[PDB]
């Protein structure tokens, strides 16, 4: 579970494990795929997707997911998590605002991202309905058995941990997690690399002038922009994405039927939608003479139909056609 710098972490820029990168309000189904720097899913070892492992300290905390909250302008709905990554059904929102509850603390993370949800169709809803026609939307999956893409996930760079740099009663005293690789020296001249167990520091004294580092590359990370490079190498760790964008047919929009009214080679149409509906036509002469107008306000319109025919498209309701001799 990677940890990075959340931008407006409740107060201001903290370093949250759930630091939000790559917000994708690019689908249609009320859904956003998000990456936390935290890797929830199974535990550290082997069990139960519905548990929760973020970083506390240098360490993980692979425990229950109890009170996740993604949210935006309104509280979102989770869809599924896998890896670093969560899918959640959100409404539109100027921002994105994520957070669980460990239990002692709220411990959330928030971010800017322009979000919208147009459904696919000539109706510009704000939200998916219960009914209407199905038609080919873009949307992310529920599932994990997924390989359609993979993002590079090589090592972490080092990280700071000044909990290490204690004092040896006059000298600044570094320690190690588990024998991990601590990269160490101070502004003064003393040990210059640091690949060690718990060292002391002969020369410097102040904690604030030393290299508290953790080369702990036993587990790779996501290659966040808010990661410091592991300077050594491009290690392996090519790793999939679960939530591929797929060609789901969203349960989708439908605009109320029109009121057809006859006139001489002319369609008066008293019209009354639910939401802004893009109407348009095609006078089937080799003179096309089409028309487009989003209609949200109910409006009686007109169409000079010709002899050979016109067609009529009340939103994603199917196209009509008309003989006006």
């Amino acid at each position: 579970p990677y940890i990075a710098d959340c931008p407006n972490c409740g107060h201001s820029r903290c370093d949250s494990p759930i630091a939000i990168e790559e917000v994708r309000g690019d689908a249609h189904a009320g859904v956003i795929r998000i990456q936390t720097s935290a890797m929830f899913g199974l535990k550290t070892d082997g069990v139960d997707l519905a548990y929760m492992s973020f970083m506390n300290g240098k360490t993980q905390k692979s425990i229950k997911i109890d009170n996740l909250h993604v949210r935006t302008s309104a509280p979102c709905s989770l869809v599924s998590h896998h890896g670093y990554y969560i899918l959640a059904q959100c409404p539109p929102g100027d921002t994105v605002t994520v957070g669980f509850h460990d239990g002692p603390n709220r411990h959330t993370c928030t971010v800017a991202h322009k979000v919208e949800f147009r459904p696919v169709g000539r109706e510009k809803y704000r939200h998916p309905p219960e009914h209407g026609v199905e038609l080919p939307c873009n949307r992310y999956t529920h599932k994990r058995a997924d390989q359609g893409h993979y993002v590079e996930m090589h090592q972490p760079g080092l990280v700071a941990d000044h909990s290490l740099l204690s004092i040896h009663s006059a000298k600044v005293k570094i320690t190690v997690p588990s024998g991990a690789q601590v990269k160490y020296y101070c502004k003064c001249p003393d040990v210059r690399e640091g690949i060690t167990s718990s060292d002391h520091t002969t020369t410097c004294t102040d904690v604030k002038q030393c290299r508290a580092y953790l080369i702990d590359n036993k587990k790779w990370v996501y290659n966040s922009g808010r990661l410091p490079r592991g300077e050594g190498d491009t290690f392996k760790g090519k790793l999939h994405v679960p939530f591929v964008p797929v060609k789901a047919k969203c349960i989708a929009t439908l605009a109320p039927e029109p009121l057809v009214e006859h006139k001489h080679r002319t369609l008066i149409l008293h019209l009354h939608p639910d939401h802004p509906t893009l109407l348009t036509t095609r006078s089937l002469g080799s003179d096309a003479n089409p028309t487009r107008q989003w209609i949200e306000r109910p409006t009686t319109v007109n169409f000079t139909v010709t002899g050979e025919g016109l067609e009529y498209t009340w939103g994603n309701h199917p196209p009509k056609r008309v003989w006006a001799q």
Partner: antibody
Amino acid sequence: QIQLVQSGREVKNPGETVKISCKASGYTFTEYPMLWVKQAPGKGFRWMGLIYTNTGEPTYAEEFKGRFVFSLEISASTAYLQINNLTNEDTATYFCVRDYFISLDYWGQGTTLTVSS
Amino acid sequence: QAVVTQESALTTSPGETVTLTCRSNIGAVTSSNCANWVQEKPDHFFTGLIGDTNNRRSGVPARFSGSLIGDKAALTITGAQTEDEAIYFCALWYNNLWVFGGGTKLTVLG
């Protein structure tokens, strides 16, 4: 539910080798590795290392890298401790243990070795 | 290369609340030390109580809870019982190995 039952206690003269078995019951062997702990007569409890019952890789505590060798009859849910070229100060009790829940949750009964001519 | 320290012996009476602590020689104990508490009853009988600081093993009475108090890991027995008379050992994780404390002999009236 979970039972780790260990071999019985041996006597061995200095220089010999011993293989102590730990037969696991109640869990899926493979998702939980094994801790080997030495509780020496006076001294108290000490971690000897851990074995990844999935891959098979052992970690030894530095005190134990050398004469000690962890292995497993995977197939029978057994983990084993082998102490070669027994030193007289290895008399003590060795426990197998399951690592789970950010610590150790179950301990075995113990197999006590008395190195003695 | 770290030394876990525990009280040597503690005596309480049935019904009382008693706290055992676990101190690390390198610094404050934190959640990344995953404090474990193990109990040894007579006959070389070991059971795990708490793991990862505050996770109670399954089938361990609720009178047992773990936590971090100050800079150390603590085990509280709330309503100690006669049955709780035993040796309690704490274990701390240090990035690559485990270090066990010396154990606390607890005596409970009964």
